[PDB]
Amino acid sequence: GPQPISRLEQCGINANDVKKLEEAGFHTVEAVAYAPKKELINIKGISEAKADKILAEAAKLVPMGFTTATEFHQRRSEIIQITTGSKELDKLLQGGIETGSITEMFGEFRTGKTQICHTLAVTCQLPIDRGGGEGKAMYIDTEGTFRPERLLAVAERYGLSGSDVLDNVAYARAFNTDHQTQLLYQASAMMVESRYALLIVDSATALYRTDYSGRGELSARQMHLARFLRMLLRLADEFGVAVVITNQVVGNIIAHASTTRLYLRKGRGETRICKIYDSPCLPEAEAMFAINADGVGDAKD
Amino acid sequence: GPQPISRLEQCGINANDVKKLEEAGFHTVEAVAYAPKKELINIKGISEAKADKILAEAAKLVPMGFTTATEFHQRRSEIIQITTGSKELDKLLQGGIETGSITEMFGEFRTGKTQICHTLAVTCQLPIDRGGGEGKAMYIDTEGTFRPERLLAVAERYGLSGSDVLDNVAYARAFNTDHQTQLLYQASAMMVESRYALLIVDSATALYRTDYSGRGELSARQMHLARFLRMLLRLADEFGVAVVITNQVNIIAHASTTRLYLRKGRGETRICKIYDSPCLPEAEAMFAINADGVGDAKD
Amino acid sequence: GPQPISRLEQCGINANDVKKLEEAGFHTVEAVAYAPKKELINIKGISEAKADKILAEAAKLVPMGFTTATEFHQRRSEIIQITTGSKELDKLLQGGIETGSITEMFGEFRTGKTQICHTLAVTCQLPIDRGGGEGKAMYIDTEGTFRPERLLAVAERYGLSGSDVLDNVAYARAFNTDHQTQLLYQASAMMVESRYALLIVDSATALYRTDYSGRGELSARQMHLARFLRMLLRLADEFGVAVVITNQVVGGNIIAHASTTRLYLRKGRGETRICKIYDSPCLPEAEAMFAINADGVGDAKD
Ligand SMILES: Nc1ncnc2c1ncn2[C@@H]1O[C@H](COP(=O)(O)OP(=O)(O)OP(=O)(O)O)[C@@H](O)[C@H]1O
Ligand SMILES: Nc1ncnc2c1ncn2[C@@H]1O[C@H](COP(=O)(O)OP(=O)(O)OP(=O)(O)O)[C@@H](O)[C@H]1O
Ligand SMILES: Nc1ncnc2c1ncn2[C@@H]1O[C@H](COP(=O)(O)OP(=O)(O)OP(=O)(O)O)[C@@H](O)[C@H]1O
Ligand SMILES: [Mg+2]
Ligand SMILES: [Mg+2]
Ligand SMILES: [Mg+2]
C-alpha cells in the first residue's frame, strides 16, 4: 500500500494540479507528505494556498503520529531481505539486503562491485519464499560494464526464464551527472505502474569526477551530488525498494545517505572478503565469498 | 513542583482562555510565566489585556525573586542523572545525562551517536534508585536508523521485559524540518497523560541540510532551527525530561548545555570527550559498543 | 543507427553551427547528446542559448529513456567481433575484439603487443562472415616498429591481395603526446568519408614518459592523458570501431574504467606466448596459449 497519487484527487485536489505534481516528480501521497512547504510552492503554477490544501489532505491518508516501538518492530518483520547468492554473505546481512534503504559498496577496482549488482538484479525477481522480492529490477549504469549475458547465467542457477528476466530489468546508461539525476524522474513514474524491488547505480560517483575537475567547481558537484542522494532516499521511502550503489576507492556526502556500508577487498585466487563498515543494526564482522560463473557464490577453497 | 496550568484557572482566568494556551504549547503556570508579553499576543484569540492578567496571576504561584544559592543547590540535587550503560562514561558525566536540559552529541559518522540514543532509550525506564528515570522514552528519527532489535538487547542486559520496553518507547520519523517541528506539538500532549523521561532527536541537523540547500535561503533556515531549539528548551523546563540530540560534523552554542564529542578507537572501542559544559570538566572517557548496548571497554 | 549529425540540422539548428561541431570532434547526433553542457559552451563562437537548443533537439532524435534489458542484449548481439588469428585466443575473448570499446594489452617487452596489432590490422579487412569487420585499418605508431612486410605475410595466410591490403591501412607515427592527440582530429574526419574498423595506438603510454620526465610535471601529463583517453572512448561510441592500445609495464590507474578489456601477455617456451584477461565485465579470468608464426598470430604447435 504505497498510496497512489490518484487518491489525492479524491480528497479535494483538482486533477489539473495533480498533473503538475507528476511532472515535478511527486507520484504518491507519501511523496507530498515527505515534501516541506517550500517544495510545493517552488513548483510552477502552484500558490501557497494550493500547497496547504495538499499537505492537509495528504496527512489524512498517511498519518504521521507517534507509534509504539513494538509496532515498528513488527514493521521490520514485514521487510523483505533479498539474498545475495552466497549463504555466508547472507548470514552477514542477517538475512540479506534490506528493502527501503540505501546500501553502499565501496572497494578497489576489479574487486567485484559490478558483479554483485548483476547477481542482485536477478535474485530480486525470485519468489519471496526463496529470498527474492517478486519485483522488477532497475539498473543505472555509468561505466559501460552492463552485460545481459551475466544476468542469464544467474537466472539459470535459480531456474528462471532468461527471456522473462531480461523483460523485467530496466537499463539505462547515464552520460553525465545532469543525465544521471534526470533518470530518477523517469524512474519514479515507472515504479507506479509496475512493481520494482531493486535500484542499482553503478557507479554513483564515476561521473562526478570527470565533469567537475577544477578546484573552484568542487562546491558545485557537492550540491549536485547531495541533491542526487536525496532523491534516492525519497524513492526508497516511497516504494520500499532496495537501493544499491557502488563507489570506487583508490566522500563525506555518502556518509548519512547510505544506511549499510560494505567494504570489498580481494583475497587469494578468485575469493573475496567482505566487511561491514557503517550499520545501525549489523555488527562489525567479516564473511568470505567467491565470484563464480553462476554469479556471487560461496567460497570453495 | 512545576505548577500545572490548571491552577492558573483557579486565580481568575477563565478556563476557555486556558485551552488556547495548551494548544499553543503551554501546559504549566511556569510555562506561561516563562513567556514574555509578545509571545501571548501573537497567539490567535488573545488580546493584550488578557496577556497582562496571565502574567500577573502567574507570578503569584511562581515567584521570580532572588533566591539563596543553597536553595537553588537543593533544587539541583533533585535532578535525575540517567546512566549511559558504561561505568567509565557515567563518571565522565558526573552521574549521567541531566534531565531538564539539552545534551548535544556531535561527532563523525559511525562514531556511535545513534547507539548512545538507543541505549539511553532503555536505561531511562529503569528505576531511579537503579540509575534510571522512571519514565517512558520518545525517539524522533530522521535518518531511518531506528532499530527496535537494539532496544531488546539492552533490555535483556538489565533484565527488563522486552515487550514492556517496546510498549514504553514512542517512535516517529520526521520527513522534513516543518514535520520535525510539528512532531513536538504532539510530543507535548503525550507527556501530559503519561510520564516521560527522555526525548531523542536523531538527527536534529540532518533535515536542516537537505531542505535548505541554497545560499540565499541561509538566513531562513537559521530562524527555523532557532525556533525549534527554543521549543526543546521549553519542553525540558516544562516536564523536566532529558533532551538528547545528535549532530553530524553556532546556533546550538547557548541552546545546548552539554556537548559531547565522539571519535572512533581501535576496533569496536570508542572515545568520548566533553566539549562545552558549565559544571563538567574537560576530560575523556573510553567506552565500547557491544551486542548488549553501550558497555565498558575490556581489552 | 548512430544518427549522423547532418540529421540534427534538419530539426532547426543552422548548418553553420553544425560545422563548428565537426571541427570540435562531434560527427553524430548521439555525440552531441553524449556531451554535457560545458563541452559545447567552451567551444569558440557558441553561446549557452545555442548549446541548449542543440542538447534539447538532440534528445528528440536520440532518446535517453530506460530500455528493457532484452533490448540492450540485442544491441550487443549486433557488435562485430574481429578475429585475432588464433582459435584458442578467439575463444578466450568469447568471439574476438569487441568493437565500440577500448581493449588494452599490457605486457613486458618482446611479448607480442606489436605483433597482435599487425595481425588485427589485416583481419579487420576480412568479411564479417569470415570474422572480419569489412573496414579499413588505422595504425598510430610511437615506437617506430611498424613493418608493412609483416602485413603482407598475414595477407597471404588469409588469401588477400597484398596490394589491396596495404591500400586499406592508414599509417602515421606520433612524435610526441601533443602530436599523438592531434592525430585523433584527423582520424575523426577520415572515418566519415571512408569506413574504418580498427584504430591501433602502439604505444599509447610510451610518449607520456619520454616527454614528461620531471616530477613537478606529473599532474600535467595525467591531464593530457585523461583527455586523450576520453577521445578514444568517444570515437568508439561514435563510429562503433574497435580500439586497441598497447602499454609497457615495468599500467596506469586512469585507464581503469576507460578500458573495457585488459589483456596480459607473457612469454612461453620458444616463440609461444601466453595471454591472460585482467579486467572485464563479461569475460572470466582465464588464460590461453598462442604462438607467433611467419603468417602472423597463430595457434601453438608444440
Ligand atoms: N563471466 C565471468 N565468470 C566468472 N568470473 C567473472 C566473470 N566476469 C568477471 N568475473 C570476475 O569478476 C571481476 C569483475 O570485477 P568488477 O568489474 O565487478 O570490478 P568493479 O568493482 O566493477 O570495478 P570498476 O567498476 O571500478 O571497474 C573480475 O575480477 C573477474 O575475475
Ligand atoms: N549488534 C551489534 N553489536 C556490536 N556492535 C554493533 C552492533 N550494531 C552496530 N554496532 C556498532 O555500532 C556502530 C553504529 O554506528 P552509528 O550508526 O551509531 O553511527 P552514527 O553516529 O549514527 O553515524 P551517522 O548517524 O552520522 O550515520 C557501528 O560502527 C557498529 O560497529
Ligand atoms: N618474421 C617473423 N617470423 C616469426 N616470428 C617473428 C617474426 N618477426 C618477429 N617475430 C617474433 O615476434 C616478436 C616481436 O615482439 P614485439 O615487437 O611484438 O614486442 P612488443 O610487445 O612490441 O614489445 P615493445 O613494443 O614493448 O618493444 C619477436 O620476439 C619475434 O620472435
Ligand atoms: Mg564495474
Ligand atoms: Mg545515526
Ligand atoms: Mg610494441
Author numbering:
A (entry chain E): 21 to 270, 289 to 339
B (entry chain F): 21 to 269, 290 to 339
C (entry chain D): 21 to 270, 288 to 339
What does the paper say about this structure?
An essential mechanism for repairing DNA double‐strand breaks is homologous recombination (HR). One of its core catalysts is human RAD51 (hRAD51), which assembles as a helical nucleoprotein filament on single‐stranded DNA, promoting DNA‐strand exchange. Subsequently, RAD51 is recruited to the DNA overhang to form a right‐handed helical nucleoprotein filament (NPF) in an ATP‐dependent manner (Bianco et al, 1998). The NPF is responsible for DNA sequence homology recognition in a duplex DNA, usually the sister chromatid, and formation of a joint intermediate that will serve as a priming site for DNA synthesis needed to copy the missing information (Benson et al, 1994).
